[PDB]
Amino acid sequence: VRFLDGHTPAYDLTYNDVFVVPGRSDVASRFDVDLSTVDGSGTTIPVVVANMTAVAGRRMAETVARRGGIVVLPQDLPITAVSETVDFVKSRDLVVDTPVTLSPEDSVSDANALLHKRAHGAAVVVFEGRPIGLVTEANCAGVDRFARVRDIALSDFVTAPVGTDPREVFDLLEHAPIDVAVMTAPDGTLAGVLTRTGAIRAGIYTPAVDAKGRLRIAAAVGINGDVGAKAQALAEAGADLLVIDTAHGHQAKMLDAIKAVASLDLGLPLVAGNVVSAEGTRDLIEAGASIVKVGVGPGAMCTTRMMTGVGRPQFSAVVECAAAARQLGGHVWADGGVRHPRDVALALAAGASNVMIGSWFAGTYESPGDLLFDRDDRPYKESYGMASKRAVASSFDRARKGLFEEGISTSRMSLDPARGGVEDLLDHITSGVRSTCTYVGAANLPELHEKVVLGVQSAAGFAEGHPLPAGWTA
Amino acid sequence: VRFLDGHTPAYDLTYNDVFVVPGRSDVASRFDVDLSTVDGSGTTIPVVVANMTAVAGRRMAETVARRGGIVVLPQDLPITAVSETVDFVKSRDLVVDTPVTLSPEDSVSDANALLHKRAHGAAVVVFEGRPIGLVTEANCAGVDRFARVRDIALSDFVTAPVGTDPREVFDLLEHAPIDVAVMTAPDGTLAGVLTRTGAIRAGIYTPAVDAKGRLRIAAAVGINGDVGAKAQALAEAGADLLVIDTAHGHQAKMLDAIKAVASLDLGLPLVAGNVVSAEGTRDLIEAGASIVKVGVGPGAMCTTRMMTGVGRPQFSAVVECAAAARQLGGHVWADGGVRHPRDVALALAAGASNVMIGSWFAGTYESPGDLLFDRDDRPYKESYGMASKRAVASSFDRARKGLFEEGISTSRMSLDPARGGVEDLLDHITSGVRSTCTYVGAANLPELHEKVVLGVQSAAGFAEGHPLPAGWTA
Amino acid sequence: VRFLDGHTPAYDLTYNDVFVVPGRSDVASRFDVDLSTVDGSGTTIPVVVANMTAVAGRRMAETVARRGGIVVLPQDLPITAVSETVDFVKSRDLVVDTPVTLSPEDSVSDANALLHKRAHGAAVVVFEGRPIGLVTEANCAGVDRFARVRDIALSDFVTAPVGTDPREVFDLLEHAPIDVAVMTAPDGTLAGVLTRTGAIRAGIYTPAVDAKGRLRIAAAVGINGDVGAKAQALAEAGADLLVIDTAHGHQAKMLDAIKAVASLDLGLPLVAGNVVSAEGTRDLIEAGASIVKVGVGPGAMCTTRMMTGVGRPQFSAVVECAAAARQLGGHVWADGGVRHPRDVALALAAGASNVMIGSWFAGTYESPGDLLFDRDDRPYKESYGMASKRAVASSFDRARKGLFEEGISTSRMSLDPARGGVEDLLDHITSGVRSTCTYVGAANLPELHEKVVLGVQSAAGFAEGHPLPAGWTA
Numbered sequence A, B, C: 001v002r003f004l005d006g007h008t009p010a011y012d013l014t015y016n017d018v019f020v021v022p023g024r025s026d027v028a029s030r031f032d033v034d035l036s037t038v039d040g041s042g043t044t045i046p047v048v049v050a051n052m053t054a055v056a057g058r059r060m061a062e063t064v065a066r067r068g069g070i071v072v073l074p075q076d077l078p079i080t081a082v083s084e085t086v087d088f089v090k091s092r093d094l095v096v097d098t099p100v101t102l103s104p105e106d107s108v109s110d111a112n113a114l115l116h117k118r119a120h121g122a123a124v125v126v127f128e129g130r131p132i133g134l135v136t137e138a139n140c141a142g143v144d145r146f147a148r149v150r151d152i153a154l155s156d157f158v159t160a161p162v163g164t165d166p167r168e169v170f171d172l173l174e175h176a177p178i179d180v181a182v183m184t185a186p187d188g189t190l191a192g193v194l195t196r197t198g199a200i201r202a203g204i205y206t207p208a209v210d211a212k213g214r215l216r217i218a219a220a221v222g223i224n225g226d227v228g229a230k231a232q233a234l235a236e237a238g239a240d241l242l243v244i245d246t247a248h249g250h251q252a253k254m255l256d257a258i259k260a261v262a263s264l265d266l267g268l269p270l271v272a273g274n275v276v277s278a279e280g281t282r283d284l285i286e287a288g289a290s291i292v293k294v295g296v297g298p299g300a301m302c303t304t305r306m307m308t309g310v311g312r313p314q315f316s317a318v319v320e321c322a323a324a325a326r327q328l329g330g331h332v333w334a335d336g337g338v339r340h341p342r343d344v345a346l347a348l349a350a351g352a353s354n355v356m357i358g359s360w361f362a363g364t365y366e367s368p369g370d371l372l373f374d375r376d377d378r379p380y381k382e383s384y385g386m387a388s389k390r391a392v393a394s395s396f397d398r399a400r401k402g403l404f405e406e407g408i409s410t411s412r413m414s415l416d417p418a419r420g421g422v423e424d425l426l427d428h429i430t431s432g433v434r435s436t437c438t439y440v441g442a443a444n445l446p447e448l449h450e451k452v453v454l455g456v457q458s459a460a461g462f463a464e465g466h467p468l469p470a471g472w473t474a
């Protein structure tokens, strides 16, 4: 990557320390930018959801796959749960999203708690598989928590058969009191819902799909136990990409695990991490990993820097690892440290094929965690780290190891008061990346990497401009 | 521009990172400094008001033109509105400012709301074109909001015929209860008002005038649609300077727009932006632009740095672009990032012929926005960015593009509790620039650029000294 | 009035010290109660608006007359203003209320300020006398204060010809976004508006009308100057009832004023006050007053009790004065001390034919005072006393008398956040009085007075029950 003349600092750089210098551009519109990655992950946007149980959820898997990203299922997850998640995700419609379905015999408290699992803001009441009404927080207020859904269902809603183009669906929702359109199967049963903004996103985003046309989903493996058997089980479960994830990827056990997984001829892209050095990246690639995850410390839930002093500023680690990987024909993923879309844009300009986002997406409706409200009624979700699940492996022995494992760091991730869904965060990230590409003058991510000119700034340089509003960032 | 020996940082510098080293000076008095620019814009002070609808107003146009600056009317403004604004501004007196005129049949609420549109603090009551009394917030308090002006007009005020020198007008207002002197036409009709400080400013500031002696006013054009026709219409409307404004000035569409506008032989200075690179500046100049606006990111309403990572510290961008422009005989304008008069002084020392100021002037009475009061009764005005108006261009399509445009960032710009007018901000800026010139030893802005010696400081270096009081800065 | 056995306190009683004992009742429904008074004032509800400039307004006059009450115009008001108010009030429709009319050339600030002068919450935009749209606070938010009404008018609204019954109008407003129905004249011009609740109130309340069928309005005279000439001028102005109002009604000047007014054979009911004694009531009646206002001290703006020690608990004064008046065939009005509808009910049970309400109605949209918002954005209106206007009458002399006049007491009357109109207060008062009549067993106010059984309670007795919500009371 090219830097400005004289911009050779005596220290490693974070995303806060660097900026993109605009160049001559033929890309006028942001829609002219192709955001598809070339690392073999199949994502049409450079966003990858981290393999953390607080963020990598089933609903998030479906949503991110529909919007073009991929979700790495967290490691040590039961094979039955992984198989169920893959079966559900790969059965989802490419355009129509799955709503919250309630039977009329359900309770009002159950409806209210289930309502916030999606960004639609309304839940479809179905009887015998056919939609009956919409449950909304407006009609659930002031109602007994254990009344039946029959007493709160709203009999009016917009219907359209599945397969209708987003144009008419957007037109139908022009003056609908509820912004949710209930898509119906040709036999009349519920096929899903299409939000007014969901139609636009379907027109804009191309879903990340496998060879069979189903939504892509990834899974993660630890290096504890028989890594080969776990990788084989995850491959047979339907995972389209395997991630070997460890806190310290540049270690002998990681190389052995990569060799074991790569020796099975599994036919899937191999992701290994994390390393922050060129030597670690080259060792991981030579072990058999096609993609090398980058970043030790910048994770928002990571306490390695404060507890151990071990780490590296994410931007410099990503540039070094990307240079090392593309020297050998591999790719890298920027993992951790993503707070703003500028972080994604700089990671892509740094040479990363994909950017892994963790705790930022935890503050979304689609996150597996339960939505919580603080004393000010501001919605939030708890984000927690993988902790021992990312480490290398009688109650006495359990407590003995547990005395030294890193604690589970917990943080409050406030939801956007109006745009709390993960689709809105994806919109912000993709719009920022497309703006970066237009400023650089690139129609695709590889052109963004080759054509980018970067500079170094001080704290005052980062302080320039308007901060993003609350909810738009982590 | 010359830097101190060894001051070659490995990063780009903002205004916060640089300081001016005093040199041998023959300029003892600040009034000995000539602040007139040499870029062809005709401004007698280096202050230019940004083409933002929140700041670039009709009253601000008149005031800034009278005080020697110029105001760029925001782009996409209707041609009828632009023509009306130019006709009003160019009909204003060079010395006497236009007051708030109220008929005796007007309401008290209307008088109170209109009172804060000017910095005078009093509104002239006129009957049949002749002044009758002064409406002041003091006499509007405790009065029914829909009483007539007749019940609140103050029958006493200082009168003087138009053309009287500022000396006698200042003498007449020595002990007047209201600091406003009502200037009258030779036939007795109202010709305007001359504030006690307005007389001093008229004695100090030389208005920016065109060949016909009328106040100068500028207009802006976007690069969407037929740029040539819009430039022709703005030229026929009476604009003395045309600004081609885009978020990314270093793009093919911008070069085409500059070529189209410059091919009309319009006979006006051409301003294009924004770029932060020497290549962009040279390309814009070769396209036909006499002046190149500089700055992508430092705008207070700009979220490009946080959303996209694209940007550049304003001082380094300005020095590079000014060197590139004066290498080809052109000029540059420093756009955005101006919070204190030191920013203007450093931009001028950096090589910028003019400095463009945006959201800072939004917190003034003359700003087109309505004056607002927070919970603490502190006056403020809302400043908002151009957003899609600075970008490159069925409700479905409108929402589809609108999903990716940068949001309209809004900020609170508190007015100075005692000096809320834009004339006071101009006084602070011009006094700071004159002090910088005296410290350097220069009697004019070009001498300021050639003779300046600059240094680099850390955060502690910027922390030295006394911060400016509230209202004096953005 | 009959009291409970043994309930003979050694002190005078307020409304707080007494309660109504329910009796055998044949009145099952509250609509079976006839609230019409028999004092000759012509009011169909026992509510009279006090002659205070803070409450007795033109809009309040129209509204209260339409709902069946009467409004006494404050004394010392100019005869031209009184004539204009009477002409406007008597030209109002008996069913359709006058809206806030805005021309399309009006400003947004003017529309917003005028919007709260009525309880409709919407203002009708009229061009050439024909309605065009509705201005609402929803569409006035975020708009420039001096934009034209054209930019904020809402093109949709419910129309119905004048004379349509309230049934269809209520049906038409079943799902209208704005609760205002624009009534049109047969030629298409605006005839007024009919609020959804206004239709119900028209079906419930019978307007107080004179012999010619126009809305009734009263006026007040002080005892300073030529009282006879002022009474004659007010009678020719169209007032249907004259009130001779003084702080101390039991004085020689008051008797002379009553004799002078009653000697003109004006043909209108005569109201004189205030007295709190049987002797004062009998003297006022023998002087020529048909109705005697009762109460010295209980007025919310009255400081006589605290400043002078002179006063009387309102309930005992009302019972004594009512007994004295009906001993001579006269009537009394309970003036002051009305905070809750229970005060009106007890005053009626005490023998008062009508109840005069002052500062309580000042916290309404129809009040002549301007609507104000405190630091918590809670709407309120300032209520102030008559002060010297209720008393007995060179700047030195003016200051000499002014040194001894009672100060103008000012209080904050918070508006009901949802029911800020005076029609809602009238609804509460009338519903409470009807409930009292049903509990007593009376179909009319005279039967309420004869059939009521009252008791005495301590502070704990008053503390029993649920307090009324905010806005429902003073």
Ligand SMILES: Nc1nc2c(ncn2[C@@H]2O[C@H](COP(=O)(O)OP(=O)(O)OP(=O)(O)O)[C@@H](O)[C@H]2O)c(=O)[nH]1
Residues within 6 Å of the ligand: A056, A057, A058, A059, A060, A099, A100, A101, A102, A103, A106, A114, A117, A366, A367, A368, A369
């Ligand atoms: N009636 C009803 N129950 C639901 C619905 N979605 C989920 N549930 C129930 O709630 C449980 C938790 O829901 P989810 O959190 O979406 O399920 P999950 O498999 O844990 O998915 P993630 O948290 O996204 O990883 C499910 O196991 C169901 O029992 C719905 O639409 N309707």
Ligand SMILES: Nc1nc2c(ncn2[C@@H]2O[C@H](COP(=O)(O)OP(=O)(O)OP(=O)(O)O)[C@@H](O)[C@H]2O)c(=O)[nH]1
Residues within 6 Å of the ligand: B056, B057, B058, B059, B060, B099, B100, B101, B102, B103, B106, B114, B117, B366, B367, B368, B369, C146
């Ligand atoms: N009576 C009266 N009305 C005024 C006066 N100045 C402005 N107005 C009215 O208020 C409206 C808004 O005023 P301005 O904001 O100064 O006008 P503008 O053309 O929008 O100018 P900018 O906001 O400075 O761009 C005008 O269109 C007039 O209708 C004045 O002195 N007297």
Ligand SMILES: Nc1nc2c(ncn2[C@@H]2O[C@H](COP(=O)(O)OP(=O)(O)OP(=O)(O)O)[C@@H](O)[C@H]2O)c(=O)[nH]1
Residues within 6 Å of the ligand: B146, C056, C057, C058, C059, C060, C099, C100, C101, C102, C103, C106, C114, C117, C366, C367, C368, C369
């Ligand atoms: N455009 C317009 N102006 C109005 C309207 N109502 C009142 N005004 C104006 O505002 C002034 C004050 O209104 P009001 O307070 O209702 O008039 P008022 O005669 O003082 O009546 P009260 O305060 O009720 O005693 C009037 O003199 C008019 O100039 C309306 O509907 N439209």
Ligand SMILES: Nc1nc2c(ncn2[C@@H]2O[C@H](COP(=O)(O)O)[C@@H](O)[C@H]2O)c(=O)[nH]1
Residues within 6 Å of the ligand: A050, A051, A052, A247, A274, A295, A297, A298, A299, A300, A301, A302, A303, A304, A335, A336, A337, A338, A356, A357, A358, A359, A360, A384, A385, A386, A387, A388, A390, A406, A408, A409
């Ligand atoms: N050391 C450590 N890293 C973690 C933990 N949880 C998440 N991470 C790392 O941080 C990344 C997410 O960073 P984020 O996007 O939340 O800033 C994950 O993909 C993973 O690499 C943890 O408990 N410990």
Ligand SMILES: Nc1nc2c(ncn2[C@@H]2O[C@H](COP(=O)(O)O)[C@@H](O)[C@H]2O)c(=O)[nH]1
Residues within 6 Å of the ligand: B050, B051, B052, B247, B274, B295, B297, B298, B299, B300, B301, B302, B303, B304, B335, B336, B337, B338, B356, B357, B358, B359, B360, B384, B385, B386, B387, B388, B390, B406, B408, B409
């Ligand atoms: N990208 C961007 N730049 C803006 C916007 N509004 C204003 N600007 C830039 O910021 C300048 C003003 O900066 P300020 O003086 O307010 O710090 C303008 O002249 C323009 O160049 C906006 O919405 N987006």
Ligand SMILES: Nc1nc2c(ncn2[C@@H]2O[C@H](COP(=O)(O)O)[C@@H](O)[C@H]2O)c(=O)[nH]1
Residues within 6 Å of the ligand: C050, C051, C052, C247, C274, C295, C297, C298, C299, C300, C301, C302, C303, C304, C335, C336, C337, C338, C356, C357, C358, C359, C360, C384, C385, C386, C387, C388, C390, C406, C408, C409
């Ligand atoms: N003494 C005195 N009485 C007043 C004043 N203002 C109003 N009042 C009395 O108080 C009555 C209204 O009482 P309220 O209903 O506000 O409690 C009026 O009708 C009048 O009799 C004032 O300034 N002084």
